Amino acid sequence: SMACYGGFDLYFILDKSGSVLHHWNEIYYFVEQLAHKFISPQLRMSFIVFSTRGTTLMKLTEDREQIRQGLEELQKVLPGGDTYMHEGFERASEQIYYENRQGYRTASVIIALTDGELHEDLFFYSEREANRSRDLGAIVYAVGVKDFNETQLARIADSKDHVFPVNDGFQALQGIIHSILKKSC
Template identity: 55%
Template sequence: MPRGHDDKRGEEASCHGAFDIYFVLDRSGSVYDNWGEIYEFVEQLTNRFVSPKMRVSYIVFSSRAEMILPLTGDRYEIEEGLKKLRKIRPAGETYMHEGMKVASEQMKAQVTRSSSIIIALTDGKLEVYPYELTVEEANAAREFGARVYCVGVKDFDERQLVDIADSKDQVFPVLAGFHALKTIVNSIWKKSCTEIFSIEPTNVCVNESFNIVLRGYDFTRGRSQEGVICVLTVNQKTYS
């Protein structure tokens, strides 16, 4: 996939962590003139996650939700999903809970639970009832081990997004408007990337008990450590 262009230092940093990313994107009528900037933001961020085990889903919401790309790690399918995403024509209301629900349903359908990230983007204040439903859906996603990040552009209500996201630290305000979305790609990448650099011990004996030590980056994200999922695969057998 083509590389993003927001980092002017030359070679861009990338994340090799293996997890599922759900983009939940506002396609209501208020973003009609700015969908190009939303698309570029998603494309650039997608290109930062380079692990072959990473999977992506694109979901858009307005008066209802639509799954543009079901969860997949196939790079060709991701490219095709980006092409479909680019052609979206925004219209309708801002029902973020519908998009969150589609993400949670995909998590629920997975045979093996995996580390998941939801990146939800909106440009407006949610009405009271949709806001309450969105908080409920975000909490449901966290029950499946997801971390929830929110991007608010221009006329959003930050208090609402703090309640939806894992914490205020996981809310990314873009007050300067849609053209400034590219300026937060690095920030989201840094806060959402979890990688394992090494596992010790590297050799063990049969019938010997031992402790496993993981070394890596950013294991402390999320509201609580109870939401951490550890899955090991040994000789094609999975342990969790």
């Protein structure tokens, strides 16, 4: 939009499945490096985890003491369980719809992480919820930790242009997240 966004948000929808048990020390490094880079008070961020229960580990806040208290909690999260990536998206969909009712034309950004890709009965709902969150007005990015089908994340993200490996992920999302900060008010 040519009108600048009154708010700007960020959602770290993070996998804590059994598949990321040997990779949580790399996922946690990716989240802290994006939180301690964007220190602007215009940007709020929320930490959503999912293995079996999609659980909001930190609400949509901006207080850098709370986010530091949020990041001290993500370091001590034990991976394990299934991969319910649709319930990672439902906690963000309860926050986009809650923040579309403020009169502020904000901008929701969603970052997803997955090693163990989803079964057919679970990929059907995570593709459905990612269609639901885009209808709520979000921009879904799908950051990929180690080996993953791009096609299984092509439906989840906006396109194949929005799927990134995790080593290139901070190299990608350095200016991709920053592109809308200058676009904002």
